[PDB]
Design a protein around this ligand. Structure first.
Ligand SMILES: [Mg+2]
Lengths: 49, 49
């Protein structure tokens, strides 16, 4: 939503002017964060951990 | 001599009010429809200077 404003100083009998609540968005665009690791079968067998 | 009074609502003077919320003015309006006709104009004499 738009910021709050100050009401307007006006004459008598004058039109009340429009300054309506105005809207926008922030767009999220979720980015795929990825991580890989590869290990050989002999490595997996021989390692202590 | 006949005074002919027409009103769309009721029989006599119609008063209407309005509130203007854009300008903060109240109005009062009045209306009547009127004619006048002689049924016999030979029933009347004018005095001329
Ligand atoms: Mg503004």
């Amino acid at each position: 939503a738009s910021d709050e404003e100050f009401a307007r100083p006006t004459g008598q009998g004058a039109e009340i002017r429009d300054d309506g609540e105005t809207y926008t968005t922030v767009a999220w665009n979720a980015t795929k964060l990825t991580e890989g690791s590869r290990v050989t079968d002999e490595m997996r067998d021989q390692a202590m951990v | 001599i006949h005074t002919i009074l027409y009103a769309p609502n009721g029989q006599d003077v119609e008063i209407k009010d309005y509130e203007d919320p854009i300008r903060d003015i109240t109005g009062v309006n009045g209306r009547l429809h009127v004619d006048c006709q002689y049924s016999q104009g030979r029933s009347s004499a004018t005095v001329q200077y």
